[PDB]
């Protein structure tokens, strides 16, 4: 820096601990043993009084680890060995989500023979789901909560509910007050637990679904006691509450714990569900709609497995900055996290200045792309209870920039074993592992060279690799684009930004053979961003047109020339219409088809890709827009060539 007083240091283990390399210990002991003290009178020997020095140095280098390790795992940031880490994270009010279970919301169409109104659908209601990898075997599902239905018009019910993965288990115990009640099994999401004490309720403390202002006692506690087996216990209370604390049981009670077995994260597949329902006259009519909400759906979400060590720490210390409340942008990031986490990979919450209130939250699920709903409304509620009262949280989701690879790994036929396929898929996750590690998160770029070094790491036989690249960014509403929106953040390499597909309708009738007629739904269109010019300029065009439908007037006169503005391949009769700006140096796209004044009904479905290729090799990011590649959901752009070599 400038002024030397700013040097300080980061977290630094002082020279007091550190610990021996051996022979340096031999050096310091000899100087302390021979010198300053004795000037040997030793009766052993010339060599023995020497030799015996390191015989007690191995005693030091030993006791300088066995007993010196404690201070390493005593603190947090410097500790290793999970157990100490976790156990020291609860006094920061965290807990590390030992495992997780899949969750969806399905709407059952069923009906009853009794026709009775207000049919119920109790807690368990065992379902089973393949969570498809191919077909064979189910897992399990349980609704776990309540709901209700209503009969309307025709006699049917829509008892839409939500469901967790595992089954349930209930172990009742007599409280001895000397007996640290626990579980022992490798399971039991702490997110969803009940734990009645002989009456009901006992909403505990560490995790609220309500927060039930006041309500005093009846809380309990859940921590760790290392070992993987969760600890339950109760406060210091008396209730002869006395003043403040947990109600405590009284010396003998039936304590009924019920948890969810949570088979594991293997269940992310979801898709087809079956009733498996035996209760009463409910028919279980099926027509089960797994995703009746909104756009594209991955199946279930969550599934957990225990959090890694490098995760906990970062979330362990930051929760001292908060106390069980979110007033700050960095707080929502910690509240959208292992509490509600495993359903969200990254957040970066922010507040827009033009629109007060309304804390905006970008989130990417591990399932990829969009959170759908009711997994969003769920994130909504869990915040607003701990939130800053007037402002309402909202989930916008980030603005996704994917990339189109088209890479070729060029292996050698000699050294393979499983040959193609298995390697075709082995290259997938390695690429996928690159995203998840480096560029999955915000503000981070990626370099295709770094993707290729994980590509070349596939197994052995793959030698060399290479790719073209295109940055794909898909518009939502289309037809317009927002005001000064739709920006790559990178240099666009003009003569790029190529269309997608589109289509047309109308165009009079144009009857065809066979049946009566058609709507002339063929003859598509597509957009091209043309050239650069004196500074930015460059315009853009909507696409190929034959004749007829448009409003020409004086303001259109469709043309860019036979110059660049490359041509779509069809009959198509050219006559490209000018539409919008696209300033190159500061990356901006602008369309507003209303310039040429067509009808939106003449266009097919919106949400069209555009995908210009980048100028520079490395692709940057800003303004809360991720670059993350997820294959399994959208295969549409990934293409790889295995073209081999025979030696």
């Amino acid at each position: 820096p400038v002024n030397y007083q700013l040097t300080r240091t980061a977290n630094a283990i002082p020279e007091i601990f550190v610990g021996g390399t051996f022979a340096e210990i031999k050096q310091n002991l000899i100087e302390w043993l021979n010198g300053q003290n004795e000037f040997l009178d030793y009766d052993f020997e010339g060599s023995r009084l020497n030799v015996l020095c390191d015989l007690l140095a191995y005693n030091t280098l030993y006791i300088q680890q066995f007993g010196n390790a404690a201070v390493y795992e005593s603190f947090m940031r410097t500790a290793n060995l999970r157990s100490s880490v976790v156990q020291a994270a609860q006094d920061n009010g965290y807990l590390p989500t030992s495992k997780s279970a899949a969750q969806t919301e399905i709407m059952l169409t069923c009906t009853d023979a009794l026709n009775r109104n207000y049919i119920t659908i109790p807690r368990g209601t065992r379902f089973l789901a393949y969570a498809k990898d191919t077909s064979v075997n189910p897992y399990n599902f349980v609704s776990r909560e309540d709901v209700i239905a209503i009969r309307d018009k025709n006699n049917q019910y829509f008892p839409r509910l939500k469901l967790a993965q595992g089954r349930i288990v209930r172990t009742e115990i007599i409280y001895d007050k000397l007996t640290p009640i626990i579980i022992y099994d490798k399971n039991i999401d702490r997110n969803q637990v009940k734990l009645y004490v002989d009456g009901a309720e006992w909403i505990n403390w560490t995790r609220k679904s309500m927060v039930h202002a006041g309500s005093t006692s009846t809380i309990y506690y859940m921590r760790e006691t290392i070992d993987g087996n969760t600890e339950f216990y109760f406060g210091e209370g008396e209730i002869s509450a006395n003043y403040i604390g947990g109600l405590k049981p009284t010396q003998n009670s039936t304590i009924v714990i019920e948890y969810i077995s949570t088979n594991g994260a293997d269940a992310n597949g979801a898709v087809g569900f079956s009733y498996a329902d035996t209760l009463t006259n409910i028919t279980v009519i099926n027509i089960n709609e797994n995703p009746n909400d909104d756009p594209d759906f991955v199946g279930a979400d969550g599934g957990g497995d225990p959090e890694d060590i490098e995760r906990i720490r970062e979330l362990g210390t930051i929760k001292r900055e908060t106390q069980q409340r979110c007033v700050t942008a960095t707080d929502y990031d910690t509240f959208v996290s292992e509490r509600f986490g495993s359903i969200i990979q990254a957040v970066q919450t922010f507040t827009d200045s033009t629109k007060p209130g309304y804390a905006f939250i970008a989130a990417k699920p591990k399932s990829g792309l969009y959170l759908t709903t009711v997994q969003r409304e769920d994130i909504k509620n869990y915040l607003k209870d701990y939130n800053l009262a007037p402002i309402t949280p909202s989930i916008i989701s980030p603005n996704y920039l994917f990339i189109k690879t088209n890479l070729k790994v060029t292996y050698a036929l000699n050294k393979l074993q499983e040959s193609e396929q298995w390697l075709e898929g082995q290259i997938i996750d390695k690429i996928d592992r690159y995203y998840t590690e480096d560029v999955e998160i915000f503000n981070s770029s990626f370099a295709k060279s770094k993707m290729l070094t994980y590509v070349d790491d596939a197994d052995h036989s793959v030698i060399g690799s290479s790719a073209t690249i295109q940055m794909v960014r898909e518009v939502q509403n289309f037809y317009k684009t927002p005001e000064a929106g739709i920006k790559y953040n990178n240099q666009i390499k003009d003569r790029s930004m190529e269309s997608n597909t589109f289509s047309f309708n109308s165009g009079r009738k144009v009857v065809n053979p066979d049946t009566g007629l058609e709507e002339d739904v063929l003859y598509d269109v597509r957009i091209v961003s043309t050239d650069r010019d004196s500074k930015g300029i460059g315009k853009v065009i909507i696409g190929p047109f034959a004749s007829g439908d448009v409003t020409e007037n004086e303001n259109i006169q469709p043309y860019t020339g036979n110059d660049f503005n490359k041509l779509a391949n069809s009959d198509g009769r050219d006559k490209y219409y000018v539409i919008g700006e696209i300033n190159y140096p500061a990356d901006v796209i602008y369309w507003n088809i209303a310039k040429i004044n067509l009808t939106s009904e003449k266009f097919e479905v919106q949400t069209i890709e555009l995908y210009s290729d980048p100028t520079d090799d490395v692709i940057f990011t800003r303004d809360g827009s991720l670059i993350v590649f997820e294959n399994d959901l959208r295969p549409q752009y990934l293409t790889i060539d295995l073209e081999p070599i025979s030696q």
């Binding site: 700050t328 929502y332 007060p356 804390a359 800053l388």
Partner: protein, 49 residues
Amino acid sequence: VGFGFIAITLLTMFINVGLTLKHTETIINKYKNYKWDSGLPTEYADRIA
């Protein structure tokens, strides 16, 4: 997380003037002076060379 947060600047000089003003030394010297009243001297001293 819900508020606009704009930054603006203010500057405070704190000019320290008012040091010194120490009045330095004050000096006065008496006079024997001459009015037309005058009257008898007692002897004389100096008065020319």
